[PDB]
Amino acid sequence: KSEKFAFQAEVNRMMKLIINSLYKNKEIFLRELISNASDALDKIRLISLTDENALAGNEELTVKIKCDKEKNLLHVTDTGVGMTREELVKNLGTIASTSELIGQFGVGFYSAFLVADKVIVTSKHNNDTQHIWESDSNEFSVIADPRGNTLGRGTTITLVLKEEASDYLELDTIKNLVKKYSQFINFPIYVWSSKTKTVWDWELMN
Amino acid sequence: SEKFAFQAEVNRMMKLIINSLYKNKEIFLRELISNASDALDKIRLISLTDENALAGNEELTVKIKCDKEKNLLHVTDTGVGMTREELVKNLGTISTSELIGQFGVGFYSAFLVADKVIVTSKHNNDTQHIWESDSNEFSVIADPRGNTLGRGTTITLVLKEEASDYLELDTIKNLVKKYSQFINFPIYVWSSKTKTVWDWELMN
Numbered sequence: 001k002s003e004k005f006a007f008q009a010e011v012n013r014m015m016k017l018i019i020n021s022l023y024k025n026k027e028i029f030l031r032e033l034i035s036n037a038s039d040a041l042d043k044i045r046l047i048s049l050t051d052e053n054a055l056a057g058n059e060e061l062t063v064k065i066k067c068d069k070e071k072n073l074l075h076v077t078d079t080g081v082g083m084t085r086e087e088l089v090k091n092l093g094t095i096a097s098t099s100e101l102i103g104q105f106g107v108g109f110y111s112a113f114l115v116a117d118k119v120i121v122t123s124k125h126n127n128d129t130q131h132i133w134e135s136d137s138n139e140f141s142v143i144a145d146p147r148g149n150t151l152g153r154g155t156t157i158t159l160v161l162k163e164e165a166s167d168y169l170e171l172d173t174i175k176n177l178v179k180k181y182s183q184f185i186n187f188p189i190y191v192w193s194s195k196t197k198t199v200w201d202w203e204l205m206n
Numbered sequence: 207s208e209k210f211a212f213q214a215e216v217n218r219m220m221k222l223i224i225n226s227l228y229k230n231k232e233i234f235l236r237e238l239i240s241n242a243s244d245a246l247d248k249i250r251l252i253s254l255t256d257e258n259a260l261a262g263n264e265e266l267t268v269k270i271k272c273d274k275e276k277n278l279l280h281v282t283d284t285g286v287g288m289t290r291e292e293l294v295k296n297l298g299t300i301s302t303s304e305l306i307g308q309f310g311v312g313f314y315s316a317f318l319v320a321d322k323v324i325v326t327s328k329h330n331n332d333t334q335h336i337w338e339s340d341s342n343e344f345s346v347i348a349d350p351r352g353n354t355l356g357r358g359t360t361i362t363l364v365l366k367e368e369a370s371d372y373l374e375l376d377t378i379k380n381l382v383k384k385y386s387q388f389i390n391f392p393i394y395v396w397s398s399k400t401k402t403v404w405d406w407e408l409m410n
């Protein structure tokens with residue numbers, strides 16, 4: 001189980017706070033994830049200033065959100081700097097209204113457990129191979145992605161939604177939320193939506 | 207090397223117990239008394255083949271102590287006890303009311319009323335040690351007070367505010383009785399009588 005890890009005590013306590021104090025406005029997890037994605041794009045953009053190889057694995061700088069209503073999943077993918085394996089283990093397993101306090105203290109990512117029974121973070125960084133981080137909140141593991149490098153560069157956050165969080169699978173909801181929290185993000189944010197013959201394509205939200 | 211993490215299974219188990227028994231929480235005492243009884247049963251067996259078994263403490267009892275000022279509830283038995291290695295493994299790894307005793311996870315029902323649970327235990331083959339937890343981790347350290355128990359274990363609960371009622375004597379006596387009526391070992395509750403004096407009171 002050299003791939004299995006446990007959470008630092010403080011993180012456990014922190015996840016417990018978010019759940020007990022934000023259960024009346026769970027929709028903020030989308031805000032927090034879109035915000036994280038945006039900070040990630042800012043860093044690769046900052047890296048491309050000095051390193052001229054920074055953007056060779058994925059020239060674009062976007063944020064695409066997809067709804068798999070059949071597998072009960074919600075995907076949020078950015079083409080930011082991404083995270084190395086060691087960063088998945090250290091930065092997600094430890095740390096150094098409360099709606100505003102979370103993003104400021106650096107723990108807004110855990111707001112995802114407000115609507116998910118399981119969170120998965122797939123990531124490719126310019127200096128490592130693609131890896132997968134998974135957790136149901138009672139432990140977590142990190143393994144090399146057997147699919148190889150399918151992201152180029154960036155991160156995908158996958159949420160296996162709670163049955164009560166089923167509404168986050170309907171497009172009308174996500175679009176409303178994506179739009180409401182995409183307002184001040186300096187990057188384009190699309191949503192895989194239907195157009196009704198009935199064809200699917202990326203739809204710009206901001 | 208004094209702070210450990212709970213195994214994933216235990217984590218899952220604590221939540222289940224807490225999510226499903228929030229309606230009948232008084233169960234926690236039944237579970238502690240029951241465990242106390244098992245412990246006593248085991249030292250008694252050992253005393254059959256081991257003449258030195260009861261060297262550290264000749265009695266086979268279970269004593270319950272309420273401390274309102276400090277907000278603590280103590281459950282002490284004089285059974286076989288637990289060695290440091292056992293506290294670590296047997297506690298960190300593994301109506302449903304009567305379904306938890308079966309699986310052997312009753313202990314955790316203590317978190318239904320306690321923000322923090324402490325386990326002090328002295329086992330014939332080791333020195334006294336202390337296991338503490340708030341459910342988000344746990345730690346095991348050598349008791350700096352020495353071999354104070356002689357032999358056995360003390361379950362100390364730092365009761366939640368909404369658990370203020372288990373601090374009241376008449377309540378514990380009432381509860382300790384309903385569940386001690388089946389244990390073949392004497393259960394006492396440090397009670398009081400009005401001058402006002404304190405002394406053990408037999409419940410079964």
Ligand SMILES: COC1=C2C[C@@H](C)C[C@H](OC)[C@H](O)[C@@H](C)/C=C(\C)[C@H](OC(N)=O)[C@@H](OC)/C=C\C=C(/C)C(=O)NC(=CC1=O)C2=O
Nearest residue numbers: 036037039040043078082087091092106107108109110155
């Ligand atoms: C200031 O940076 C932020 C930090 C500090 C730190 C961990 C940054 C990280 O160092 C490895 C990378 O530099 C950064 C580019 C990676 C992301 C933003 C990831 O998101 C995507 N899309 O990559 C996010 O994944 C869930 C990382 C964990 C987030 C946590 C625990 C959180 O709750 N809040 C945080 C939000 C932040 O903005 C946070 O702690």
Ligand SMILES: COC1=C2C[C@@H](C)C[C@H](OC)[C@H](O)[C@@H](C)/C=C(\C)[C@H](OC(N)=O)[C@@H](OC)/C=C\C=C(/C)C(=O)NC(=CC1=O)C2=O
Nearest residue numbers: 241242244245248283286287292296310311312313314359
């Ligand atoms: C069958 O034995 C029981 C086990 C198996 C096992 C761990 C037994 C233990 O092995 C080291 C000792 O042999 C035994 C004498 C010690 C006690 C009963 C302790 O209580 C006192 N007073 O000593 C209790 O402390 C909280 C131990 C943890 C209890 C757990 C996790 C539980 O939830 N249920 C259990 C109840 C049991 O009866 C249980 O798992």
